[PDB]
PDB file of C-alpha atoms and ligand atoms in Angstrom:
ATOM      1  CA  UNK A   1       0.062   0.075   0.006  1.00  0.00           C
ATOM      2  CA  UNK A   2       2.799   2.440  -0.689  1.00  0.00           C
ATOM      3  CA  UNK A   3       1.851   5.502  -2.691  1.00  0.00           C
ATOM      4  CA  UNK A   4       4.583   7.438  -4.617  1.00  0.00           C
ATOM      5  CA  UNK A   5       4.603  11.107  -3.606  1.00  0.00           C
ATOM      6  CA  UNK A   6       3.431  13.615  -6.160  1.00  0.00           C
ATOM      7  CA  UNK A   7       5.500  16.294  -7.850  1.00  0.00           C
ATOM      8  CA  UNK A   8       6.448  18.738  -5.145  1.00  0.00           C
ATOM      9  CA  UNK A   9       5.290  16.789  -2.060  1.00  0.00           C
ATOM     10  CA  UNK A  10       8.732  15.784  -0.746  1.00  0.00           C
ATOM     11  CA  UNK A  11       9.964  19.493  -1.006  1.00  0.00           C
ATOM     12  CA  UNK A  12       7.173  20.714   1.470  1.00  0.00           C
ATOM     13  CA  UNK A  13       8.199  22.401   4.741  1.00  0.00           C
ATOM     14  CA  UNK A  14       6.541  20.222   7.346  1.00  0.00           C
ATOM     15  CA  UNK A  15       6.035  20.503  11.129  1.00  0.00           C
ATOM     16  CA  UNK A  16       7.271  17.713  13.449  1.00  0.00           C
ATOM     17  CA  UNK A  17       6.401  17.014  17.021  1.00  0.00           C
ATOM     18  CA  UNK A  18       9.086  16.318  19.743  1.00  0.00           C
ATOM     19  CA  UNK A  19       9.880  16.242  23.291  1.00  0.00           C
ATOM     20  CA  UNK A  20      13.499  17.462  23.287  1.00  0.00           C
ATOM     21  CA  UNK A  21      13.413  21.142  24.355  1.00  0.00           C
ATOM     22  CA  UNK A  22      14.429  24.099  22.226  1.00  0.00           C
ATOM     23  CA  UNK A  23      18.117  24.801  23.038  1.00  0.00           C
ATOM     24  CA  UNK A  24      18.645  28.031  24.990  1.00  0.00           C
ATOM     25  CA  UNK A  25      22.029  29.079  23.851  1.00  0.00           C
ATOM     26  CA  UNK A  26      22.822  27.083  20.657  1.00  0.00           C
ATOM     27  CA  UNK A  27      25.841  29.472  19.687  1.00  0.00           C
ATOM     28  CA  UNK A  28      27.099  29.303  23.279  1.00  0.00           C
ATOM     29  CA  UNK A  29      26.979  33.211  23.147  1.00  0.00           C
ATOM     30  CA  UNK A  30      28.565  35.153  26.016  1.00  0.00           C
ATOM     31  CA  UNK A  31      26.644  37.958  27.800  1.00  0.00           C
ATOM     32  CA  UNK A  32      26.380  40.876  25.353  1.00  0.00           C
ATOM     33  CA  UNK A  33      28.221  44.125  26.496  1.00  0.00           C
ATOM     34  CA  UNK A  34      26.046  46.648  28.245  1.00  0.00           C
ATOM     35  CA  UNK A  35      24.633  49.279  25.958  1.00  0.00           C
ATOM     36  CA  UNK A  36      25.926  52.768  26.424  1.00  0.00           C
ATOM     37  CA  UNK A  37      23.550  54.774  28.701  1.00  0.00           C
ATOM     38  CA  UNK A  38      20.736  56.539  26.807  1.00  0.00           C
ATOM     39  CA  UNK A  39      20.978  60.375  26.748  1.00  0.00           C
ATOM     40  CA  UNK A  40      17.422  61.713  27.190  1.00  0.00           C
ATOM     41  CA  UNK A  41      15.642  64.822  28.542  1.00  0.00           C
ATOM     42  CA  UNK A  42      14.563  68.164  27.594  1.00  0.00           C
ATOM     43  CA  UNK A  43      16.798  69.748  24.725  1.00  0.00           C
ATOM     44  CA  UNK A  44      17.671  73.200  26.093  1.00  0.00           C
ATOM     45  CA  UNK A  45      19.576  76.213  24.508  1.00  0.00           C
ATOM     46  CA  UNK A  46      23.279  75.958  24.945  1.00  0.00           C
ATOM     47  CA  UNK A  47      24.364  77.812  28.168  1.00  0.00           C
ATOM     48  CA  UNK A  48      25.676  81.251  27.032  1.00  0.00           C
ATOM     49  CA  UNK A  49      25.817  80.085  23.391  1.00  0.00           C
ATOM     50  CA  UNK A  50      28.661  78.669  21.543  1.00  0.00           C
ATOM     51  CA  UNK A  51      31.125  79.914  24.248  1.00  0.00           C
ATOM     52  CA  UNK A  52      33.737  79.923  21.472  1.00  0.00           C
ATOM     53  CA  UNK A  53      36.566  82.489  22.861  1.00  0.00           C
ATOM     54  CA  UNK A  54      34.805  85.796  22.791  1.00  0.00           C
ATOM     55  CA  UNK A  55      31.635  85.076  20.955  1.00  0.00           C
ATOM     56  CA  UNK A  56      28.460  85.964  23.013  1.00  0.00           C
ATOM     57  CA  UNK A  57      26.122  84.041  20.870  1.00  0.00           C
TER      58      UNK A  57
ATOM     59  CA  UNK B   1      27.204 106.115  34.501  1.00  0.00           C
ATOM     60  CA  UNK B   2      26.998 106.024  38.362  1.00  0.00           C
ATOM     61  CA  UNK B   3      29.290 103.725  40.182  1.00  0.00           C
ATOM     62  CA  UNK B   4      26.372 101.390  41.211  1.00  0.00           C
ATOM     63  CA  UNK B   5      25.368 100.626  37.691  1.00  0.00           C
ATOM     64  CA  UNK B   6      29.013  99.951  36.547  1.00  0.00           C
ATOM     65  CA  UNK B   7      29.769  98.089  39.767  1.00  0.00           C
ATOM     66  CA  UNK B   8      26.666  95.740  39.343  1.00  0.00           C
ATOM     67  CA  UNK B   9      27.106  95.591  35.702  1.00  0.00           C
ATOM     68  CA  UNK B  10      30.511  94.083  36.137  1.00  0.00           C
ATOM     69  CA  UNK B  11      29.201  91.591  38.558  1.00  0.00           C
ATOM     70  CA  UNK B  12      26.779  90.472  35.822  1.00  0.00           C
ATOM     71  CA  UNK B  13      29.789  90.333  33.397  1.00  0.00           C
ATOM     72  CA  UNK B  14      31.912  88.359  35.877  1.00  0.00           C
ATOM     73  CA  UNK B  15      29.016  85.825  36.400  1.00  0.00           C
ATOM     74  CA  UNK B  16      28.682  84.976  32.682  1.00  0.00           C
ATOM     75  CA  UNK B  17      32.408  84.735  32.105  1.00  0.00           C
ATOM     76  CA  UNK B  18      33.053  82.636  35.312  1.00  0.00           C
ATOM     77  CA  UNK B  19      30.093  80.198  34.125  1.00  0.00           C
ATOM     78  CA  UNK B  20      31.489  79.960  30.728  1.00  0.00           C
ATOM     79  CA  UNK B  21      34.959  79.447  32.048  1.00  0.00           C
ATOM     80  CA  UNK B  22      33.911  76.508  34.325  1.00  0.00           C
ATOM     81  CA  UNK B  23      31.965  74.876  31.352  1.00  0.00           C
ATOM     82  CA  UNK B  24      35.149  75.045  29.079  1.00  0.00           C
ATOM     83  CA  UNK B  25      37.156  73.149  31.800  1.00  0.00           C
ATOM     84  CA  UNK B  26      34.268  70.628  32.177  1.00  0.00           C
ATOM     85  CA  UNK B  27      34.216  70.250  28.377  1.00  0.00           C
ATOM     86  CA  UNK B  28      37.846  69.411  28.176  1.00  0.00           C
ATOM     87  CA  UNK B  29      37.680  66.800  31.012  1.00  0.00           C
ATOM     88  CA  UNK B  30      34.422  65.354  29.496  1.00  0.00           C
ATOM     89  CA  UNK B  31      36.007  64.943  26.134  1.00  0.00           C
ATOM     90  CA  UNK B  32      39.105  63.384  27.708  1.00  0.00           C
ATOM     91  CA  UNK B  33      36.935  60.709  29.479  1.00  0.00           C
ATOM     92  CA  UNK B  34      34.647  60.000  26.607  1.00  0.00           C
ATOM     93  CA  UNK B  35      37.635  59.446  24.250  1.00  0.00           C
ATOM     94  CA  UNK B  36      39.570  57.069  26.558  1.00  0.00           C
ATOM     95  CA  UNK B  37      36.556  54.934  27.569  1.00  0.00           C
ATOM     96  CA  UNK B  38      34.253  55.084  24.439  1.00  0.00           C
ATOM     97  CA  UNK B  39      31.219  55.204  26.817  1.00  0.00           C
ATOM     98  CA  UNK B  40      29.666  58.454  25.513  1.00  0.00           C
ATOM     99  CA  UNK B  41      28.014  59.999  22.658  1.00  0.00           C
ATOM    100  CA  UNK B  42      31.211  61.629  21.428  1.00  0.00           C
ATOM    101  CA  UNK B  43      33.936  59.484  19.609  1.00  0.00           C
ATOM    102  CA  UNK B  44      31.466  56.942  18.912  1.00  0.00           C
ATOM    103  CA  UNK B  45      32.829  55.265  15.819  1.00  0.00           C
ATOM    104  CA  UNK B  46      30.446  52.842  14.129  1.00  0.00           C
ATOM    105  CA  UNK B  47      30.453  49.088  14.299  1.00  0.00           C
ATOM    106  CA  UNK B  48      28.628  46.873  11.684  1.00  0.00           C
ATOM    107  CA  UNK B  49      24.835  47.062  12.101  1.00  0.00           C
ATOM    108  CA  UNK B  50      23.510  43.731  13.397  1.00  0.00           C
ATOM    109  CA  UNK B  51      20.180  44.136  11.445  1.00  0.00           C
ATOM    110  CA  UNK B  52      22.185  43.007   8.443  1.00  0.00           C
ATOM    111  CA  UNK B  53      22.586  39.438   9.651  1.00  0.00           C
ATOM    112  CA  UNK B  54      20.203  36.858   8.260  1.00  0.00           C
ATOM    113  CA  UNK B  55      18.978  34.353  10.728  1.00  0.00           C
ATOM    114  CA  UNK B  56      17.104  32.126   8.379  1.00  0.00           C
ATOM    115  CA  UNK B  57      17.885  28.325   8.338  1.00  0.00           C
ATOM    116  CA  UNK B  58      20.635  27.812   5.957  1.00  0.00           C
ATOM    117  CA  UNK B  59      21.553  25.298   3.195  1.00  0.00           C
ATOM    118  CA  UNK B  60      23.590  23.380   5.884  1.00  0.00           C
ATOM    119  CA  UNK B  61      22.977  23.229   9.596  1.00  0.00           C
ATOM    120  CA  UNK B  62      26.253  24.140  11.439  1.00  0.00           C
ATOM    121  CA  UNK B  63      26.318  27.856  11.293  1.00  0.00           C
TER     122      UNK B  63
HETATM  123  C1  3PE C   1      31.752  92.544  11.707  1.00  0.00           C
HETATM  124  C2  3PE C   1      31.740  93.958  12.359  1.00  0.00           C
HETATM  125  C3  3PE C   1      33.131  94.369  12.916  1.00  0.00           C
HETATM  126  C4  3PE C   1      33.945  94.870  11.811  1.00  0.00           C
HETATM  127  C5  3PE C   1      35.387  94.938  12.271  1.00  0.00           C
HETATM  128  C6  3PE C   1      36.106  93.433  12.132  1.00  0.00           C
HETATM  129  C7  3PE C   1      36.660  93.226  13.502  1.00  0.00           C
HETATM  130  C8  3PE C   1      37.319  91.780  13.199  1.00  0.00           C
HETATM  131  C9  3PE C   1      36.362  90.636  12.990  1.00  0.00           C
HETATM  132  C10 3PE C   1      36.992  89.399  13.543  1.00  0.00           C
HETATM  133  C11 3PE C   1      35.612  88.833  14.237  1.00  0.00           C
HETATM  134  C12 3PE C   1      35.328  89.577  15.509  1.00  0.00           C
HETATM  135  C13 3PE C   1      33.783  89.773  15.670  1.00  0.00           C
HETATM  136  C14 3PE C   1      33.430  90.325  17.013  1.00  0.00           C
HETATM  137  C15 3PE C   1      32.025  90.187  17.312  1.00  0.00           C
HETATM  138  C16 3PE C   1      31.587  88.893  17.432  1.00  0.00           C
HETATM  139  C17 3PE C   1      31.376  88.487  19.055  1.00  0.00           C
HETATM  140  C18 3PE C   1      29.781  88.891  19.167  1.00  0.00           C
HETATM  141  O1  3PE C   1      29.472  89.943  19.405  1.00  0.00           O
HETATM  142  O2  3PE C   1      28.946  87.749  19.187  1.00  0.00           O
HETATM  143  C19 3PE C   1      27.638  88.259  19.422  1.00  0.00           C
HETATM  144  C20 3PE C   1      27.219  89.029  18.224  1.00  0.00           C
HETATM  145  C21 3PE C   1      26.129  89.974  18.594  1.00  0.00           C
HETATM  146  O3  3PE C   1      26.396  90.788  19.596  1.00  0.00           O
HETATM  147  P1  3PE C   1      25.480  91.237  20.855  1.00  0.00           P
HETATM  148  O4  3PE C   1      26.139  91.434  21.978  1.00  0.00           O
HETATM  149  O5  3PE C   1      24.425  90.119  21.029  1.00  0.00           O
HETATM  150  O6  3PE C   1      24.635  92.684  20.369  1.00  0.00           O
HETATM  151  C22 3PE C   1      23.099  92.543  20.027  1.00  0.00           C
HETATM  152  C23 3PE C   1      22.707  93.968  19.544  1.00  0.00           C
HETATM  153  N1  3PE C   1      21.494  93.899  18.978  1.00  0.00           N
HETATM  154  O7  3PE C   1      26.753  88.307  17.068  1.00  0.00           O
HETATM  155  C24 3PE C   1      27.707  87.934  16.146  1.00  0.00           C
HETATM  156  O8  3PE C   1      28.772  87.141  16.441  1.00  0.00           O
HETATM  157  C25 3PE C   1      27.654  88.596  14.774  1.00  0.00           C
HETATM  158  C26 3PE C   1      28.032  90.101  14.978  1.00  0.00           C
HETATM  159  C27 3PE C   1      29.132  90.427  13.865  1.00  0.00           C
HETATM  160  C28 3PE C   1      29.290  91.945  13.947  1.00  0.00           C
HETATM  161  C29 3PE C   1      28.657  92.515  12.821  1.00  0.00           C
HETATM  162  C30 3PE C   1      27.081  92.391  12.682  1.00  0.00           C
HETATM  163  C31 3PE C   1      26.494  93.566  13.472  1.00  0.00           C
HETATM  164  C32 3PE C   1      25.302  93.828  12.521  1.00  0.00           C
HETATM  165  C33 3PE C   1      25.778  94.915  11.456  1.00  0.00           C
HETATM  166  C34 3PE C   1      25.214  94.331  10.088  1.00  0.00           C
HETATM  167  C35 3PE C   1      25.074  95.501   9.155  1.00  0.00           C
HETATM  168  C36 3PE C   1      23.676  96.168   9.070  1.00  0.00           C
HETATM  169  C37 3PE C   1      23.635  97.275   8.133  1.00  0.00           C
HETATM  170  C38 3PE C   1      23.455  96.774   6.789  1.00  0.00           C
HETATM  171  C39 3PE C   1      23.548  97.970   5.761  1.00  0.00           C
HETATM  172  C40 3PE C   1      23.031  97.690   4.387  1.00  0.00           C
HETATM  173  C41 3PE C   1      22.941  98.779   3.509  1.00  0.00           C
END
């Protein structure tokens, strides 16, 4: 009672049931470096302007 | 101009110039630390963007 699969059947992506759990760290990755702290808040005018030498603006 | 106006105008001038001078010193020390440690917004040289990586299953398994 064996039926030959039709054209395209054997190339299907199928689902399979299993007990074995999904590996947690398959690449054995280390802990990622901490991100640089976020800079946040209200953007205010520069204090006394550019402050380049004598410029007052 | 009376002495009081000139006197207190000078204190206004001195305050701004003192505040700016302190900020200039702070900027030089902040720049020194940010460059040495790379932990601040300045001197942030780009690394490869990780959104370019493709995580799809490949033609072979071990990758
Ligand atoms: C350039 C004029 C001096 C000519 C001699 C040249 C000297 C050497 C030049 C080297 C650079 C030194 C310049 C020194 C000034 C810069 C420092 C400074 O003052 O920064 C702030 C300045 C505005 O000065 P502020 O105290 O805010 O006064 C406000 C008044 N409403 O904001 C600025 O930085 C810009 C000020 C530049 C000064 C000229 C602009 C004043 C407006 C004149 C424009 C002309 C209007 C008439 C147009 C006629 C058209 C027919």
